[PDB]
Amino acid sequence: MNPIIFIIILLTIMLGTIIVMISSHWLLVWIGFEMNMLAIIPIMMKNHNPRATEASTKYFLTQSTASMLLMMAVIINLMFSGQWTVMKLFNPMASMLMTMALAMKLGMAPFHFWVPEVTQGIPLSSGLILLTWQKLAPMSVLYQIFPSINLNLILTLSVLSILIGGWGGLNQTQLRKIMAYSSIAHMGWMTAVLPYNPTMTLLNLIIYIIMTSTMFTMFMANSTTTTLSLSHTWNKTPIMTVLILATLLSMGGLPPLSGFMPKWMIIQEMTKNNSIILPTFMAITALLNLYFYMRLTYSTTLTMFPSTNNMKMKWQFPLMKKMTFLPTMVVLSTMMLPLTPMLSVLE
């Protein structure tokens, strides 16, 4: 891809998201999703191979189906209220359709099957966009329509996502599939707290994005996409192995690291609402995520896996990949817990 075209396509992915976030009209929200999906496909296809073509097609079918369901929800809402304003919907069937559509866009269980497959089939930089920037627009709509979402539906989606994400990640050796199942699990926490306090949804989204970007950036730095390939990092860039360890423990929600903060705050909001079983079930189930995060720390940082002879040739060359913002993101990913009261800026 021509570098100027790449920039314009990236700017259009962002513009589609921004249109969703600033729109007060359902039609313009729908346009933002359509524009965003138009521009994302070329970056999934950019390495020209059958796996990328299959990933883009599966992505197109999922997202186009979800956008039709969203349009249907908008039109039912129009018939039963005669207006287009982005806010609570005025029809329960419209609310269900919009909630299901946004769940499909987010890749929440049981609409999750596309996330591991699409992420596996596209390059790391494209997977980084898919699992971070692409969550912004659907979450920003849930943030606004939540007063009318069915509580049982949204909490069922949350519970299923945490279970499917945790279980699905246990069986993965591909790094892109691990991040995909991790994303499904984390979307579950974001939506579980939405009915009670949307500010905690934003907090979990922001911290999720920071930690996810850090992992993908460190994977890109070494061009690693499998567990075994990552296990050679200790013999090339020892500093990276330590940063991965800290980030993985943070993603596992261990105190005193940053990733504990969203789980801590979400549990607090739920208990204030006399929700005790669900937070406890959620916290225990998230130990499945911690398990397959720990497995990666074992093969990356806490033990030294076997190397190859050609690895010595790599010793003579320095890392040349950009690793943009990596030093900043890794610090935020791990060392933010003492600043937890700062979440009020998100109010």
Partner: protein
């Protein structure tokens, strides 16, 4: 206000001190980022590019200060809203009649 980071009414609050402990921690985080930047690029960690390390601290402190300003303003607004609501609805927040422990009956549970 509306889509305003620090509305005009936030200017009535005392600003965070430049020696705020939270701002010191934010500066410390920027310093740690500077060292990690040296490490991942295999430069002498403590000595390389002090100009780069200085800007890491400055950038964190600069952003941290405004974030701390907004944080304190939001909590001031939470308290403002709460107290005004307690006044608006005195019927829901009555002064409880307080009794001394000489009058209040508490069951005794021996540990034997």
């Amino acid at each position: 206000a509306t889509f305003q980071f620090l509305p005009d009414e936030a200017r009535s609050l005392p600003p965070p001190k430049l020696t705020d402990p939270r701002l010191a921690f934010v500066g410390f985080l920027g310093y740690c980022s500077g060292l990690i930047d040296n490490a991942i690029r295999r430069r002498p960690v403590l000595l390389a590019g002090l100009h780069r390390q200085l800007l890491y601290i400055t950038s964190f402190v600069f952003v941290g200060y405004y974030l701390l300003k907004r944080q304190d303003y939001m909590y001031a607004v939470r308290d403002h809203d709460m107290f005004s609501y307690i006044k608006s609805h005195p019927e829901d927040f009555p002064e409880k009649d307080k009794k001394t422990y000489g009058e209040v009956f508490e069951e005794f549970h021996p540990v034997r």
